[model samples]
Target: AGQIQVLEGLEAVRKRPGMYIGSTSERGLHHLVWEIVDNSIDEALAGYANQIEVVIEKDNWIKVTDNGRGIPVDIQEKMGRPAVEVILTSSVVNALSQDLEVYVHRNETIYHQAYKKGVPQFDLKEVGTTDKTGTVIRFKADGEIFTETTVYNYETLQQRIRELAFLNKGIQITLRDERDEENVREDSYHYE
Candidate 1:
């Protein structure tokens, strides 16, 4: 009973993704990428991050990395869980994803966590050490939710990324398409 209550929010999202996201079509599909990118952009706006990279990995997995104060890893005062876990668990993007993983480089340590459909696979763990501070979020949109298509269009992503960079001067954003290993392509935008 407790477990089902905890998952009720995610179950609602899975049942009617369009209500949370606009639609289950390609537009909604791409929205997930923007959702994550927006979070990094928030850090950039706060003057903590200056670089953001978006990678289109094989099998339609999207990875977004930012050089910023990584999502807070300390335990939340009320939630008791690490701040990162609390943040991701309630994320609409995470709830709609088939699989999601986060690597938080903060306090000179690298913390890792994985989730499926908004359920934490395990408690956040210290994976290693890092000299830099940033966050790396990688997720695959759930095919069941995005019934129309789960693939991403490079040009479509490129245009928006370019616009965002142009709008936010001094912030460098790069979009890389690694879906085709033979012909790797990358575009970088920085309006300084």
Candidate 2:
């Protein structure tokens, strides 16, 4: 078996985020959301998912969920780690986030993992049972990296989601602003 490799890619990303993500400004901040959403969009394009949900939770934590095949949990041969860990530890979004959590519902069980600045907090573990298959990711932007702002604009997200729905046609994408619990707002886009 191969040894677990330290994620040097994450270190490089943390040191030079602009190189990996364009800029640390608002555009770059929004780009982080798109990076993750694009993964879900890939699932939709592959026909494994039809529903995608984006939620702006309190404290500016972004939550993206998709009804797709959950990230594979089986051990990966090359890295000697679970596929989910290998996937996330190498992700630019995980490398720049202050904190990130992943919950994957697959194989009749729920698997969970958390990270800080791209480092795993603990080994992935089974969290519960689930009858569904999908993936959920929640992350908070690193204030140190996004010094300009960490707030998310609802309209910005709505516009892109609408475009993605129109372009994808059958896939459904929903965006919800739940930061203000008293006045929650949501919009779902579906072409079919």
Candidate 3:
């Protein structure tokens, strides 16, 4: 049997979350949620998971559902914890940070730190989606993440995801900001 790819350790990743995830600040927290979804999108790539729908629930509980395959509902083989618990935890974000450093190949963390290529576009070559089925990974951002911009705007987040879904074609990304109604307009190439 082929050996599973095992990462050595994440000591520094935990110690210097700022250096790895960019910061423990608002941007870092916002990025944590995005990273989790990115993992599910990889499952979609494998065809097991597709149709990921996002929802922002009461008290800022963010939820994501995928029509492909649900996250492992049983206990993990090694960890003994529920797979759902494992995936939903902030560990997903840590794993992604580790992944970016490893396979991103650009050999530069600056691109990630800079919000390069417009908010969480995957590496063309990374190839996620483990199962031919797909997986749904979800989590909520800390409420303080909203305070970072002082805008408290959900529609802006919605439009950004909408445009991405349109431009990307097959992929569906939704930004549900847990609002009664969204009040935002369309965007066109920033200043176009």
> In candidate 1, what are the lDDT values of residues 127-166, reduced to their tens digit?
9998999999999999989988999999999999999999
lDDT by residue for model 3 over 1-118, one digit each (tens)? 1112112223334445567667666566555656655666676677654455655555444455555554443556764544443333325353433222111112211111111111
Best by TM-score: 2
Indicate the residue-level lDDT of 63 in model 2: 98
Q: What TM-score, computed on C-alpha atoms, does each candidate reach?
A: 0.96, 0.97, 0.50
After superposition, the stretches of candidate 1 with alpha carbons farther than 4 Å from their true spots are 1-6
Candidate 3 local lDDT, residue 48: 59
Clashing pairs in 3: 42-129, 43-129, 47-132, 47-133, 48-132, 48-133, 48-134, 49-133, 49-134
What lDDT score belongs to each candidate, Candidate 1 first?
Answer: 0.93, 0.94, 0.43
